Design a protein around this ligand. Structure first.
Ligand SMILES: [Mg+2]
Lengths: 134, 135, 133, 133
């Protein structure tokens, strides 16, 4: 899938809104292979690390954690949170073929990241679905 | 190859007590302390829970994951991720660093409130970090 | 860590010579988070796949294989070779913070890739440590 | 797949012979899921690391390197060699559903490890096929 035109504009709007609601630094919608479909960064945040690099590693992780998921009786993990000392990463499925990625620091309440991140992933899943079908 | 740590005597008992208490406080199914190499140092299961999946395999996979996510961590300016949560439709996994050479692992289902898992899971990892060192 | 001026030139020169002596297609010096410090491609070789993506994947692999390394009594693997039907990949540690990557096909003698690759990594390791000093 | 009866005995013989020919420490036939189908250790070698753990990590690696393989135009890497300061790991596809694993040290010439490792992988592939059939 490749987002362009109206669907792309709609996806970017959701990402922009998600950053405002969550307090996150960077938001991306990527396919499960690591291709960046859309991305937005908070004006207040510093330049992000290379986004294509981030996307590729997130996709790699999505494939890698399936062994753990299957051992627990799940096909795969739909939501994952990775927290460091200063930076955090939130990844949630945006439909069966895409992933919403949020990179955040201490100023983004985790509860808000998850609440609005989950809602954004559903909105993006719908946009991706329609872009794919007609 | 040997673990970065092995529990016996008092240290083991203190660790097991933390694991048992954590299961009660969180509602989780299984609790383990493993070294970053994948060896299980101590493990406890909730009395109500069914037989767990192979714990050695679980520990190995968690250890493999801990190594693998370091590329992402470095990209974000971190040495590594200290806390990680993986959520499926029903089953979830909570992993937190217990000192520099061990990891606390909690496997839970829908009957374990996530807020409780993280709250008591964090307390457990710190307690185990202290035990691991003195051990 | 980023290479500039002379240090960068010396790095590129080493990569160029390594391609010549090994017959490999692409040579890169990357860090553990997938950043490309320097790269060179053989003139005869086709356009390479996205180099930043290649570096990213190699970095991801470098992190992941440490679990296996430790089980075998090693902190990590210093040298790795991945071989497909036609394409191959050689990765060698260039110090503690960099990796030398050589992508090759059937026209590159593996013996030479490993022999000169190892030596090139040592040279690049010095250029790097001297670039941050 | 689960090896038993004659097929299992034949597989074990291949592993034992491979150890004799290579001087490797441990030899294993595992499925791509990480399950150990058969394994043998050199009598002169020290206790091996937990083999089930090793297999699980080798299988994980096999899945992880496919992205790199595909970027280079390969479906996956058929052969891989990881070398540390002293210990080495050789993994080769034994058919479409299994992997031959050899753990060796500086005393086992890599050339012979690869030659007999490849021979063994082909033999084990045929045995696994029959067993399943
Ligand atoms: Mg020379």
């Amino acid at each position: 899938l490749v987002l362009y035109g109206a669907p792309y504009e709609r996806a970017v709007e959701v990402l922009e809104e998600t950053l405002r609601e969550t307090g996150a630094r960077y938001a991306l919608l990527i396919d499960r292979k690591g291709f960046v479909l859309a991305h937005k960064e908070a004006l207040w945040a510093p330049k992000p690390p290379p986004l294509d690099t981030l996307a590729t590693l997130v996709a790699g992780n999505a494939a890698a954690t399936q062994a753990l998921a299957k051992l627990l009786g799940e096909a795969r993990f739909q939501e994952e949170v990775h927290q460091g000392e200063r930076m955090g990463l939130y990844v949630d499925e945006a439909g069966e073929h895409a992933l919403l990625v949020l990179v955040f620091d201490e100023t983004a309440p985790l509860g808000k990241v998850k609440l609005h991140g989950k809602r954004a992933s559903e909105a993006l899943a719908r946009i991706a679905e329609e872009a794919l079908a007609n």
